[PDB]
Amino acid sequence: SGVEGAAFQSRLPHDRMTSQEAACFPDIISGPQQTQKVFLFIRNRTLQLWLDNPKIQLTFEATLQQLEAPYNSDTVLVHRVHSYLERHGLINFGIYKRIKPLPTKKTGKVIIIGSGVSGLAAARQLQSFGMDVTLLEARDRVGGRVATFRKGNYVADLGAMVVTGLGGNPMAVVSKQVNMELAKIKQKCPLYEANGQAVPKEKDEMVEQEFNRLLEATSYLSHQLDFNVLNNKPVSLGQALEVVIQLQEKHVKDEQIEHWKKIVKTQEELKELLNKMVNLKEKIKELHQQYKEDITAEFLVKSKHRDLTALCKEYDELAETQGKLEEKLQELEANPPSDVYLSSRDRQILDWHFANLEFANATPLSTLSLKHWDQDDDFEFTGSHLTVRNGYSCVPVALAEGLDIKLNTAVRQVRYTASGCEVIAVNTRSTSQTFIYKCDAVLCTLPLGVLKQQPPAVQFVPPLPEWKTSAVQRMGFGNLNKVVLCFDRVFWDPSVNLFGHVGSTTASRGELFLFWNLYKAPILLALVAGEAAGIMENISDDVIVGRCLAILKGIFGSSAVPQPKETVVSRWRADPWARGSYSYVAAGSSGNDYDLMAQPITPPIPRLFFAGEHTIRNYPATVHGALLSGLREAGRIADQFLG
Numbered sequence: 001s002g003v004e005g006a007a008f009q010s011r012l013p014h015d016r017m018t019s020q021e022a023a024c025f026p027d028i029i030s031g032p033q034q035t036q037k038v039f040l041f042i043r044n045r046t047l048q049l050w051l052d053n054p055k056i057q058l059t060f061e062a063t064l065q066q067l068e069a070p071y072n073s074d075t076v077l078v079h080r081v082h083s084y085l086e087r088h089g090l091i092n093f094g095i096y097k098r099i100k101p102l103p104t105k106k107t108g109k110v111i112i113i114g115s116g117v118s119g120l121a122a123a124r125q126l127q128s129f130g131m132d133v134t135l136l137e138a139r140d141r142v143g144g145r146v147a148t149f150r151k152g153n154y155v156a157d158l159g160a161m162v163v164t165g166l167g168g169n170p171m172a173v174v175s176k177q178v179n180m181e182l183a184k185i186k187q188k189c190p191l192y193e194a195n196g197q198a199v200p201k202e203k204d205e206m207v208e209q210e211f212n213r214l215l216e217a218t219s220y221l222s223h224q225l226d227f228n229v230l231n232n233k234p235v236s237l238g239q240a241l242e243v244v245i246q247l248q249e250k251h252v253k254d255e256q257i258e259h260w261k262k263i264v265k266t267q268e269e270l271k272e273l274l275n276k277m278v279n280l281k282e283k284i285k286e287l288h289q290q291y292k293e294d295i296t297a298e299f300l301v302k303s304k305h306r307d308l309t310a311l312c313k314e315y316d317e318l319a320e321t322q323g324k325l326e327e328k329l330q331e332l333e334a335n336p337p338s339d340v341y342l343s344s345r346d347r348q349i350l351d352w353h354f355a356n357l358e359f360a361n362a363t364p365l366s367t368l369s370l371k372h373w374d375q376d377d378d379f380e381f382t383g384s385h386l387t388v389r390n391g392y393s394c395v396p397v398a399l400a401e402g403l404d405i406k407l408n409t410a411v412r413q414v415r416y417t418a419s420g421c422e423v424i425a426v427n428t429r430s431t432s433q434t435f436i437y438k439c440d441a442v443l444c445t446l447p448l449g450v451l452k453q454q455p456p457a458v459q460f461v462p463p464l465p466e467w468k469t470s471a472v473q474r475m476g477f478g479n480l481n482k483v484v485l486c487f488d489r490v491f492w493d494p495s496v497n498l499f500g501h502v503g504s505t506t507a508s509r510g511e512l513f514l515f516w517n518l519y520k521a522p523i524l525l526a527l528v529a530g531e532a533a534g535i536m537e538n539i540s541d542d543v544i545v546g547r548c549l550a551i552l553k554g555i556f557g558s559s560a561v562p563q564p565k566e567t568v569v570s571r572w573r574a575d576p577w578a579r580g581s582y583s584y585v586a587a588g589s590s591g592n593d594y595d596l597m598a599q600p601i602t603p604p605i606p607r608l609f610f611a612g613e614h615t616i617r618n619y620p621a622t623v624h625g626a627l628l629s630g631l632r633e634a635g636r637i638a639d640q641f642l643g
């Protein structure tokens with residue numbers, strides 16, 4: 001599966017054209033299948049070549065000279081394919097040598113708002129497409145939601161930090177380009193309760209098993225019984241979970257009842273049995289006496305005998321059918337069903353798994369769309385998740401190489417007319433001096449959090465379409481902060497990549513719930529998800545770092561946890577250039593909104609385009625998702641202006 005592998009790594013089916021490829025190649029799709037059979041191969045072969053060496057640019061003639069007979073003969077077809085793959089970022093993207101110099105004459109002027117991974121991606125494309133591009137960044141750096149703390153030998157990511165499986169992941173290519181040092185995450189994750197004592201492997205799995213069961217349940221109700229709407233309002237994942245758990249609690253009490261009923265019943269049957277026994281116990285005194293009292297005694301005590309014995313053939317007899325009761329009685333009162341669904345402690349551990357989810361989605365479960373929260377699930381990449389051992393910032397930096405980025409430039413208004421665009425921005429360091437950049441098209445990679453901001457951070461003239469603003473408002477933009485604790489000593493298990501901390505209450509189940517051991521230097525990361533994420537931003541670094549040490553000193557014991565010589569704390573929600581961590585499908589929305597976002601705004605011809613982790617439906621809230629959305633718009637614009 002050589003050429004079959006390339007197709008896969010590019011999120012493409014090696015044995016069939018996609019709806020898009022069919023749109024650009026109608027002649028092929030609607031023609032001899034033998035031809036379509038050829039198209040694919042060339043496509044899969046071109047990709048193969050590019051992936052087997054993403055360091056250097058794969059030119060048209062470079063591809064045409066590496067194909068074999070008879071493919072290399074159909075030059076025209078090869079070109080159409082090669083060109084296509086290049087125009088849509090499937091080849092020659094990221095950072096690579098340009099064996100063919102860029103045209104001295106840049107055709108088309110486009111302004112890109114934001115120097116994030118999505119912005120830098122599209123930027124390098126449009127530029128390589130021989131087009132004058134300019135990026136306006138508000139921050140004094142690049143990467144946007146990709147930040148990395150670097151001081152001495154210390155390295156830590158305050159933003160992105162994980163690479164979700166290399167299989168099919170575009171970052172796999174970029175990684176190979178920027179020499180990004182990655183490392184798998186050892187699944188071994190020990191949980192420590194409030195006091196500080198670990199959780200026995202038994203429960204750790206007992207609870208986690210239920211966690212999966214409850215989720216599966218919610219999935220059932222949602223995608224099988226269609227329980228996505230209640231009281232005319234959308235149902236949230238958390239909402240559903242609370243209900244499912246509310247049922248398990250019921251069932252538990254139900255069995256507890258039937259059991260108490262069996263008990264009471266057996267007890268009733270006993271008290272009753274003992275009663276007549278005492279009546280027969282008395283019926284014996286009537287015969288064990290009165291005897292030896294009739295000259296025909298030879299037949300008197302003779303008959304009476306089988307009468308007193310017959311009554312004993314009952315008493316000690318009932319003891320038999322009475323024995324089969326003490327057994328059942330003691331047997332039941334010794335095998336009582338689960339007193340409760342989850343103990344006060346069981347719930348605490350389960351909250352860790354929910355908090356762990358509130359971390360993944362970067363928002364409280366009660367705000368997630370029970371039906372669409374996991375809409376992009378069918379697009380995950382195969383392979384183990386990785387961590388950027390050397391700071392995830394090494395990527396956006398390499399991408400900004402050779403680009404015209406103007407840091408310290410906050411865009412405050414975007415003007416798009418039937419012909420031409422104007423992007424008015426101001427210098428952050430000196431809000432007095434403003435700037436006015438003219439262009440043909442504008443690419444807005446602004447975070448959903450900024451677009452939602454009220455009052456608006458940037459002004460759109462004419463005002464953004466109604467179908468757009470509404471989508472922006474319906475979508476959800478989560479939050480998630482970290483606390484980088486820099487030490488000069490590793491007092492924790494060096495083998496364990498991450499360990500968790502269980503909270504005391506459901507409310508604060510996301511407060512420093514997970515610690516990370518990823519970087520070389522003695523550094524740990526504390527995550528604050530869910531409710532805590534936003535709240536914790538109102539607490540000074542001092543107190544925050546304080547609470548952390550406490551947690552640590554409770555796990556590793558005090559006197560073993562030294563004072564951090566360097567500490568970093570994020571507040572993406574407070575960050576004026578972010579206003580949150582990343583998007584998420586909120587109850588009352590869907591992946592459909594992730595397309596309305598991508599939809600360009602047009603007055604007779606598309607002028608304003610959008611990109612970002614909130615515009616790519618199948619790969620939302622991710623570095624690669626943002627990357628792909630970048631390459632996406634890159635081509636979209638290229639067609640609109642270069643054709």
Ligand SMILES: Cc1cc2c(cc1C)N1[C@H](O)C[C@H](c3c(F)c(F)c(F)c(F)c3F)[C@]13C(=O)NC(=O)N=C3N2C[C@H](O)[C@H](O)[C@H](O)COP(=O)(O)OP(=O)(O)OC[C@H]1O[C@@H](n2cnc3c(N)ncnc32)[C@H](O)[C@@H]1O
Nearest residue numbers: 114116117118144145159160161162411581612613622623
């Ligand atoms: C916020 C955040 C986001 C992420 C994150 C952590 C945080 C705190 N890390 C976490 O480690 C776990 C997720 C994680 C996960 F999410 C998952 F889904 C998952 F499955 C996991 F397993 C994870 F581990 C993860 C990760 O580990 N792995 C991931 O793949 N993604 C992660 N994310 C999300 C990504 O950071 C995010 O998708 C990406 O950064 C998006 O990039 P972008 O689209 O270019 O957006 P941008 O903000 O970078 O760029 C906008 C630019 O515009 C500028 N700007 C602003 N305002 C103005 C003006 N007014 N004028 C001019 N300019 C301007 C801004 O300043 C920028 O320069």
